Design a protein around this nucleic acid. Structure first.
Length: 83
DNA sequence: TGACTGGTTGGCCACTCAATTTGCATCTATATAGATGCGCATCTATAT
């Protein structure tokens, strides 16, 4: 989770070996972080990251509330991985 | 004649001093057993 936050937050750049035509172009840090109930996200380590960067964490009520993060894995299976 | 006799140029007390014994109070500097607190292993529980 900390590696994924580091990539999300820092400005992104990729070399020509990724062959991109666009730039990812996103950066900066959240005001809130919303997660499942997994130990990874309820760990003290993430809580210390939250307090230093200033983004309080929140646990989702049910997997169906996570629709924004859950659905992209179906979309990746269909458009990318099944080929 | 060989005897006799006479002749004759410190202690008893009161006071004092060096000493030297004996005892008591005061450090003192070490020796030595018990609380207290990390620092990790180990087990249990919970979640995806």
């Amino acid at each position: 989770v900390a590696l994924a936050l580091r990539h999300a937050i820092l400005p992104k750049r990729y070399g020509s070996e990724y062959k991109l035509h666009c730039e990812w172009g996103t950066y900066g840090k959240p005001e809130h972080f919303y997660t499942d109930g997994g130990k990874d996200f309820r760990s003290n380590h993430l809580s210390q990251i939250g307090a230093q960067l200033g983004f309080v964490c929140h646990l989702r009520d049910r997997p169906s509330e996570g629709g924004v993060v859950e659905r992209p894995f179906k979309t990746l299976n269909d458009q990318l991985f099944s080929t």
